Symmetry: C2
Subunit: 348 residues, 2 copies
């Protein structure tokens, strides 16, 4: 069945890729109607203006929904595609980090000085982010370890932490570390009976799961993520490389980065249906990205024949399953239809 609203519902699961398909051409494409590949070409101050709009949206440490828009809609497209990340290595992919989801990225040999100084910086960077989250005023942030994804956030205060894609072994290791969570005999009589006669006594899985932590108990999880060799890989392509941290507001050692963009034109069978494709790749697709991309489409009036809709798709969200279950303000969705009058999705 179909579900619908005036505006895009929020989903908090981070994905790996976004694809958007339309029957109406994008502004840089308008010369062409033959099948082929097209560069997303930017013009004059559009990138810089989009960067301004992004930082102005997130300056307080949480989103301001009342900032005025830029003038070029290309700046809205640019502002949707930005984030802050640590650690930094050129030429190594830093997301996704769960070992099952890596394609075989190439080896990179590094010096012990490089790896040691990186770890020394990582501890300070992580402690700064966690301090500003708990006792300061920062909104939220993500961590992607080799075995799980973690989200720290606030309830609309009360603090909440969510862990996803755990095994029973990881659950028991966290129990040994002392974390608590709001998770989702006749054999003794037999041994006693054997001993009473004088016969010799020598004669949980539950798949993948998520976890939720409330309140003061979050600090134990913070110390656990600081300490364990379980999350610090000692063998493999990510040997001695610490976990990835991601945010939408600046932090010390954070590097500003952008997703890769490209686009294509397809034509078929002599029909009216030429199809125009946009892609955003090679990083996390954070929840604000879809919200801003909706505004890019509606500002550029591609909905004007609402009888020809535009569709959007976000991929690999199942690796972070559970991050939208803890509240009524969020939703799980995978494919979305945009019109000017509404936004629609399946019952899922």
């Amino acid at each position: 069945a179909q579900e619908s609203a005036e505006d895009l519902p929020t989903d908090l699961r981070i994905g790996s890729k976004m694809r958007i398909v339309s029957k109406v051409s994008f502004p840089w494409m308008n010369t062409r109607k033959s099948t082929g590949n097209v560069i997303v070409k930017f013009q004059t101050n559009d990138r810089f203006d989009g960067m301004q709009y992004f930082n102005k949206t997130f300056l307080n440490g949480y989103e301001d929904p009342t900032v005025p828009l830029p003038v070029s809609p290309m700046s809205i497209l640019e502002a949707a595609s930005l984030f802050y990340q640590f650690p930094v290595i050129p030429g190594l992919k830093m997301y996704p980090r769960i070992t099952a989801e890596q394609e075989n990225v190439s080896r990179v040999s590094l010096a012990p000085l490089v790896t040691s100084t990186m770890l020394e910086q990582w501890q300070e960077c992580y402690a700064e982010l966690y301090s500003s989250y708990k006792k300061g005023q920062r909104g939220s942030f993500y961590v992607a370890t080799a075995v799980c994804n973690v989200l720290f956030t606030k309830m609309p205060q009360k603090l909440v932490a969510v862990i996803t894609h755990t095994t029973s072994a990881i659950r028991e290791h966290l129990r040994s570390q002392g974390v608590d969570f709001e998770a989702p005999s006749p054999m003794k009589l037999a041994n006693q009976w054997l001993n009473e006669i004088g016969v010799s006594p020598r004669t949980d899985r539950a798949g993948f799961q998520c976890l939720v932590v409330h309140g003061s108990k979050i600090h134990a999880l913070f110390n656990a993520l600081m300490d364990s060799d379980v999350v610090h890989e000692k063998t493999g392509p990510y040997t001695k490389i610490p976990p990835t941290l991601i945010a939408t507001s600046p932090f010390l050692y954070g590097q500003l980065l952008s997703l890769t963009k490209s686009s294509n034109i397809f034509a078929k069978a002599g029909t009216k249906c030429t199809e125009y494709e946009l892609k955003l790749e090679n990083g996390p697709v954070l929840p604000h990205c879809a919200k801003m991309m909706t505004q890019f489409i509606r500002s550029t009036n591609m909905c004007s024949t609402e009888e020809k809709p535009v569709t959007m798709q976000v991929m690999d969200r199942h690796t972070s399953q559970g991050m939208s279950d803890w509240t009524e303000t969020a939703t799980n969705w995978n494919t979305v239809t945009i019109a000017e009058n509404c936004v629609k999705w399946t019952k899922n």
Copy 2:
């Protein structure tokens, strides 16, 4: 000597490598400890976050806004006065200063071809973005450091664009003219207007700034600014503090040092506000002294206008600023 004075801090655009501040009155965190040697700087809860907030609110539009209200904590300004953006960064390697005459034994590093090649492609994009925003947008200024040179890009107060190069040689000046950069030559160099584009192309293309030997093999030049840019990393300077007695007399030393990176004009300006807000100035024989090192390699950067100035040492009074004229 020529003791010179004003009400406020005069501007020096030469970039320092090291800063030292000396007082006969204790800094606020030190007040428990009453002996010589090291003491570790410590912050209360929101100091390092409110400082970052104030810093980005100052430089939000790509130039300084002087009208921002100040933080509550005095301690925020020390953190906020020591933040800057830099590309490229490798962990555990010195990125500034680059000019090969001024180097320590900088640490041995080796890297695979993949990392250096990908880093070069990223640098080629990033440099174009900074130059484009500067030439045809509101971005005020930025710095470039490189193995045999030092470059500043700025604008003079709808404005006239100026580029300055320092610490040249005969081979470097001849090589720039062979590259087609033709310039005024008052050793430093000055370029204006449309002729800046040829220097941008020469910096992008030229073999000279891309040495294939030594520790800085195949590393591109360093790019530095105060407001964010693509691939830029937010960083901070090292801080440390120290105490002495003045040779057994009742006078005493309190010392604060900032190290490991460039030192920029806004740093000294906000340091002045830190001293003038802590009420540390209020003793008559004992005003506070400030010193900056190694500005001579950047000499010439303060000459192109009357509003800039060269100085190496400043003494602070609550209503005035006094220094020896250089």
